[PDB]
UniProtKB/Swiss-Prot annotation:
Family the UniProt entry places it in: Belongs to the ARTD/PARP family.
Biological source species: Homo sapiens
Free-text tissue specificity from the UniProt record: Ubiquitous; highest levels in testis.
Localisation per UniProt entry: Cytoplasm; Golgi apparatus membrane; Cytoplasm, Cytoskeleton, Microtubule organizing center, Centrosome; Nucleus, Nuclear pore complex
Parts of the chain that traverse the membrane: none
Subunit structure comment from the entry: Oligomerizes and associates with TNKS2. Interacts with the cytoplasmic domain of LNPEP/Otase in SLC2A4/GLUT4-vesicles. Binds to the N-terminus of telomeric TERF1 via the ANK repeats. Found in a complex with POT1; TERF1 and TINF2. Interacts with AXIN1. Interacts with AXIN2. Interacts with BLZF1 and CASC3. Interacts with NUMA1.
Function text: Poly-ADP-ribosyltransferase involved in various processes such as Wnt signaling pathway, telomere length and vesicle trafficking. Acts as an activator of the Wnt signaling pathway by mediating poly-ADP-ribosylation (PARsylation) of AXIN1 and AXIN2, 2 key components of the beta-catenin destruction complex: poly-ADP-ribosylated target proteins are recognized by RNF146, which mediates their ubiquitination and subsequent degradation. Also mediates PARsylation of BLZF1 and CASC3, followed by recruitment of RNF146 and subsequent ubiquitination.
Positions contributing to Zn(2+) binding: C130, H133, C138, C141
Residue ranges annotated for the PARP catalytic domain, each copy included: 8-209
Impact after mutating E187A: Loss of activity
Mod. after translation: Phosphorylated on serine residues by MAPK kinases upon insulin stimulation. Phosphorylated during mitosis.
Name of this chain's protein: Poly [ADP-ribose] polymerase tankyrase-1
Length: 209
């Protein structure tokens, strides 16, 4: 199954992932209630997720989407936060765990901003926070998030709630675009687990300002 390769802090690949993560911290409307109060992370390690079977499923789907999208799979690197990160790195993303109540329905959701994904690391609205101290703004406990290859293909642009079970006809993803009366930041949604690969596993802490 899955093998985790350690990236060295001196390598360009580690430094690239960390800078995407650190540079995309945004101020959130909840004033940090969900993800905590911070302006920076302390990155503990960065591992590359290797899984032959998961990679094969992802690459086959990229070929199918490409055939339906003028020979482009339209891949983006995006963040994902979830309390089920262990299941994802071993079994892959799974749309069967997605439920229809989400803003864009039963999809798998990603963000270009790491601080958005940091809000979901411990669950719904940050849940009860870290397992040891029950603190959503814990500065001690190691959190984990993924920085994923996401196959978007033909994206359907959406501004308001649209509870879908699958991608809209003739499309492969939904992009929830920001709007004055809606989202502050874009969110990217897929409806098939094989349209995302959990490429990097980031272990980190949020830092006290
Ligand atoms: C609220 C919801 C969610 N919306 C997101 C928007 C951007 C990123 C993420 C993430 N997990 O990194 C999101 N997760 C709907 C599905 C379960 N959690
Ligand atoms: Zn803690």
């Amino acid at each position: 199954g899955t093998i985790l390769l350690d990236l060295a802090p001196e390598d360009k690949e580690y430094q690239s992932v960390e800078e995407e993560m650190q540079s995309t911290i945004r101020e959130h409307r909840d004033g940090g209630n969900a993800g905590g109060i911070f302006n920076r992370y302390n990155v503990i390690r960065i591992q590359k997720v290797v899984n032959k079977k998961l990679r094969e499923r992802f690459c086959h789907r990229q070929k199918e989407v490409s055939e339906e999208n003028h020979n482009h799979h339209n891949e983006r690197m995006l963040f994902h936060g979830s309390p089920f990160i262990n299941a994802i790195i071993h079994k892959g993303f799974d749309e069967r765990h997605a439920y229809i109540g989400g803003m864009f329905g039963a999809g798998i959701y990603f963000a270009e901003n790491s601080s958005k994904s940091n809000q979901y690391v411990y669950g719904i609205g940050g849940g009860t926070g870290c397992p040891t101290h029950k603190d959503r703004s814990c500065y001690i406990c190691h959190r984990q998030m993924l920085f994923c290859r996401v196959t978007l293909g033909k994206s359907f642009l959406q501004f308001s709630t649209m509870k879908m079970a699958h991608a809209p006809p003739g499309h492969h993803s939904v992009i929830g675009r920001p709007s004055v009366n809606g989202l502050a930041y874009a969110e990217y949604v897929i409806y098939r687990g094989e349209q995302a690969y959990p490429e990097y596993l980031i272990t980190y802490q949020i830092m006290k300002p």
